[PDB]
Structures are given as C-alpha cells and as structure tokens.
Amino acid sequence: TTTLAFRFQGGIIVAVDSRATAGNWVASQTVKAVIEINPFLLGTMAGGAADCQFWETWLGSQCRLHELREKERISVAAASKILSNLVYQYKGAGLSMGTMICGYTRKEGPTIYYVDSDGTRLKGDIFCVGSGQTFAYGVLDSNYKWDLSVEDALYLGKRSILAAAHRDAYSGGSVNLYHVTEDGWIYHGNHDVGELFWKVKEEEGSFNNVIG
C-alpha cells in the first residue's frame, strides 16, 4: 500500500494505490484505499484495512451527528481529533492505522491531518504513508510547489504513486485520484498501473532502465 496527500493552491490532492497483500500473495488489485467519509471529507487507508474502514465510516457518522446538532460543517481539526481520541482509547489493544484525514473548510482552508493508531495527530502540507512511501516522497519533494495547477497537481500525485508501484513490491494495481475542494471532493478516476506505466514511460521519457 502507498497513500499520499498534499495541500496546494487549488486544495488537496489525494492519491493512492490499489494493492492488498497477504504475505507474498496478492489478495486484491482493486481495493479502495480512499474512504469517502462524507462529500467533504476524505480518509486514506493504511495498516489495518478493517480498522481504517470501520472507524472512518464511524467517523462519518460522528461528523453527521455534529452538523445536525451544531447546524454547521465540522472542521477537519475536530473530525481528525474525534478519530485520534477514539484510537487513543484503544492504544495497546492492537489497532493498526495510518491515515490522512483530508478536508477543505472556510475557517481552515485546505487541511490534512495525519492520524495514527499509536495516538499521533499531525497537521501538515504533505504526507506519504505505506510500504512505498519513500518512493512517493522522492517525486513529491522534488516537484512540489504551492502554486501548482489542479491539472499538474493531479499528475504529480499520480506519478508519485506510480514511482512507488514500480519499485515497491507490495504497491500497485491501479491509481485512484481525488481532488478536494471547499465545495467537496471530486473523483479523478481509476488508472491501471500496467497501462499507466508504459504511457508515462513514453510521454515522459522516464524509466529508461525498463525495456518497453
């Protein structure tokens, strides 16, 4: 698994792979590593599939109850903290979670919180989580700018997952792209890594080590 999320001028880009493994055995190539908490909030899946799915679905229920009671959209700060405080209660029991809670509100602007099963809650501009995180970070760090266009930002996130999918054995399958705006997230399609790799190789001139 490889998941990333970064803040930029046009909001947040979220990009993930689609592979799930049980040892060396590739269990799935079609897993959804982005959990659609609600129309405005996204969460990434890393570590425990069930733990992430279950509690981020639960998080959406808590966010919905909040806006019913307070008649106002929940902040990313408050939403992330509900999840982090929950998993902190279970600390030591064996939950496995590494997630980015991503949202775009009026008061905050585009916001990302890295939330983790040992209780960590970090606000940040760029996060990368998973077995292929180091590969994605390399492409991200060298090409990231705040003034990226939505088009170029989407490509950067796609290209960074591809970098991980190539080198990391446990990452691959397909790339899912999301763009988070103030009015909600927008899905930018599923991209098979097999087809994407050759396309990127030719158009970009990268991966000269690989024969195609």
Partner 1 sequence: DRGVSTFSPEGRLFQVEYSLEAIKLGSTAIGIATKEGVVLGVEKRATSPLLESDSIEKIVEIDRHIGCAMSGLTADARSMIEHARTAAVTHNLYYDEDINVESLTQSVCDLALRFGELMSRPFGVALLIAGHDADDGYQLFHAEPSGTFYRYNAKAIGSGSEGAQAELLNEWHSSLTLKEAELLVLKILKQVMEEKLDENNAQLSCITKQDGFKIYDNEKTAELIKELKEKEAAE
Partner 2 sequence: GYDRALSIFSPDGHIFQVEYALEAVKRGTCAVGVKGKNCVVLGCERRSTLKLQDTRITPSKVSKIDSHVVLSFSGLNADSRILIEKARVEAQSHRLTLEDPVTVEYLTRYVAGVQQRYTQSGGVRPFGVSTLIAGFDPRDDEPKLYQTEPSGIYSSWSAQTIGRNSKTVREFLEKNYDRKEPPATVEECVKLTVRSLLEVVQTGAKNIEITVVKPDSDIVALSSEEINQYVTQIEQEKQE
Partner 3 sequence: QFNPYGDNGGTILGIAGEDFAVLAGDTRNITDYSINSRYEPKVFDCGDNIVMSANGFAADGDALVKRFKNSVKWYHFDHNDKKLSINSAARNIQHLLYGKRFFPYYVHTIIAGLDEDGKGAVYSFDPVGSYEREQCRAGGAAASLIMPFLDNQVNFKNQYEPGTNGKVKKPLKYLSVEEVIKLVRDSFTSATERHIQVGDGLEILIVTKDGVRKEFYELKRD
Q: Which residues are annotated as a binding site for bortezomib?
A: 49
From 29, 58, 81, 192, residue interacting with partner 2 (rule: CB under 8 A): 81
Residue choice 26, 31, 78, 126 for contact with partner 2 (CB under 8 A): 78
Q: Which is nearer to partner 3, 9 or 28 (CB)?
A: 28
- From residue 122 to residue 161, the character string flagging contacts with partner 3 as x (rule: CB under 8 A) and all else as - is ----------------------------------------
Contact 28, 60 (CB under 8 A): no
Interior angle at CA 63, CA 42 and CA 178, nearest 5: 10
Residue 64 sits in the site that holds partner 1 (CB under 8 A): yes
Contact region with partner 1 (CB under 8 A), list: 22-30, 59-67, 101-109, 129-137: 59-67
**Closer by beta carbon to partner 2, 73 or else 188:** 73
Q: Tell me the C-alpha distance between 46 and 170, whole Å.
A: 12
- Measured between alpha carbons, how far apart are the two ends of the chain, in Å? 25
Residue 1 annotated to the active site: yes
Q: Strand ranges (DSSP E) for 85-153? A: 98-105, 109-116, 121-123, 126-130
Binding residues: 49
Q: Which of 22, 68, 93, 211 binds partner 1 (CB under 8 A)?
A: 68
Residue type at 97?
A: M
Q: How far apart are CA 65 and CA 63, in angstroms?
A: 5
Site for partner 1 in 39-58 (CB under 8 A): 57-58
Site for partner 2 in 91-110 (CB under 8 A): 107
What's the min distance (Å) between Cβ of 60 and partner 3? 12
Q: Helices 76-89 and 49-70 sit at what angle, rounded to 10 degrees?
A: 130
- Dist. CA 33–CA 178, nearest whole Å: 11
CB of 123 to partner 3, least distance (A): 27
Which of partner 2, partner 3, partner 1, none is residue 78 near (CB under 5 to 8 Å by kind)?
partner 2
Burial of 164 (0-12, 13-18, 19+ CB in 10 A): buried
Residue 114 to residue 80: CA distance in whole angstroms? 8
Contact set with partner 2 (CB under 8 A)? 70, 75, 77-78, 81-82, 85, 107
Q: Which residues are catalytic?
A: 1
